[PDB]
UniProtKB/Swiss-Prot annotation, chain A:
Protein name: Dihydrofolate reductase
Binding-site residues for NADP(+), renumbered to this chain: 7, 13-19, 45-46, 60-61, 73, 92-99
Organism, scientific name: Escherichia coli (strain K12)
Variant or mutagenesis effect after changing residue 16 to F/S: Increases catalytic rate about 2-fold
Pathway: Cofactor biosynthesis; tetrahydrofolate biosynthesis; 5,6,7,8-tetrahydrofolate from 7,8-dihydrofolate: step 1/1
Pfam families recorded: DHFR_1 (PF00186)
PANTHER family: DIHYDROFOLATE REDUCTASE
Residues holding substrate: 5, 27, 54, 110
Miscellaneous information on this protein: The strain K12 sequence is shown.
Role summary: Key enzyme in folate metabolism. Catalyzes an essential reaction for de novo glycine and purine synthesis, and for DNA precursor synthesis.
Superkingdom of origin organism: Bacteria
Length: 156, 155
């Protein structure tokens, strides 16, 4: 199966011109929990932002620039590179989420109570086509700059 | 001599109820550049938020980590640093307020972020401080806000 994992500010904003204006180690821990050694697919801009671990599959139209990870030139090649696994984790960014949302069976979302003027958004999903199977709200604290809610949705 | 090092949002905000809403690895690298192995003094809340050098923690209560040095007063904090060229006071608000009158140098990162804080860097009169270094940086893929490193020396 294919899953998407993303952290959304209000209006489904996921990315800005620069690094996101928050500090959420709990979200980093949740991201790790839910990826572990599973194959990940990401776009080239997300790869440049995160600086590797599992299979790391990077989408780019151009030849790859780091032989430690696997570079692919299409969605189909990305899926093929992950092989026959229980769950593929699509980790961003906006252009990649848009292409994989119709293929996805599960969303792992972190809803962050932050308003940020973004340039990239998580794709529109119709909540009626998705069953919320898990939800956990957390307050901001000494380590986390904003309140946040982890949610898992499974396609209906 | 005593120096303060701090990261200031607008209105001299240094701290909030919760973690600061920014991601500034360049400021962490600057903080390291300017501390390295020099003794550091910090308040107990800053200790809990963040050991390496001498790490001197102010608290009214017995210490809870024997890997660092705990002191109950400003004068003991200074004494615990020994005879060194530069003591780095790293926060927080209560600690900066007590050490500012003793300080000869400020290492400030001015961050272009507006945040409603609960704690501020102490008032200083810029006329009483000479800016000896200033370096501006844009936000980028790793740093959420633009920032300016500044070093002031007491005139
Ligand atoms: N998303 C884009 O295509 C694109 C283009 C120009 C500027 N930007 C800016 O970059 C920032 C991040 O955007 P984002 O979150 O959308 O980035 P992202 O998903 O992390 O990465 C997008 C990149 O992934 C590669 N890619 C995605 N789908 C592909 C496919 N089917 N075949 C081959 N390569 C594919 C392209 O790399 P290559 O560029 O190496 O081909 C693309 O530019 C935004 O501010 C956006 O405006 C994005
Ligand atoms: N981050 C956290 O852990 C946390 C938790 C609760 C509240 N706060 C609140 O957050 C706000 C900002 O704190 P801040 O930046 O001012 O904290 P800070 O300077 O990092 O730490 C202040 C602490 O340092 C100790 N201290 C400072 N001067 C001292 C002296 N002369 N003698 C003995 N002990 C001394 C006291 O510890 P003791 O308290 O151990 O005596 C004091 O509470 C404050 O309103 C604070 O009360 C922060």
């Amino acid at each position: 199966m294919i899953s998407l994992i993303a952290a959304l500010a209000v209006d489904r904003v996921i990315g800005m011109e620069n690094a996101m204006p928050w500090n959420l180690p709990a979200d980093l821990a949740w991201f790790k929990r839910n990826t572990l050694n599973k194959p990940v697919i990401m776009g080239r801009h997300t790869w440049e932002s995160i600086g590797p671990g599992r299979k790391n599959i990077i989408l780019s139209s151009q030849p790859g620039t780091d032989d430690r990870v696997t570079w692919v030139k299409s969605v189909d090649e990305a899926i093929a590179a992950c092989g026959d696994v229980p769950e593929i984790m699509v980790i961003g960014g906006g252009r990649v989420y848009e292409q994989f949302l119709p293929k996805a069976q599960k969303l792992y979302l972190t809803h962050i109570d932050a308003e940020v003027e973004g340039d990239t958004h998580f794709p529109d999903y119709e909540p009626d086509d998705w069953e919320s199977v898990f939800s956990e709200f957390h307050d901001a604290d000494a380590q986390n700059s904003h309140s946040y809610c982890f949610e898992i949705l499974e396609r209906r």
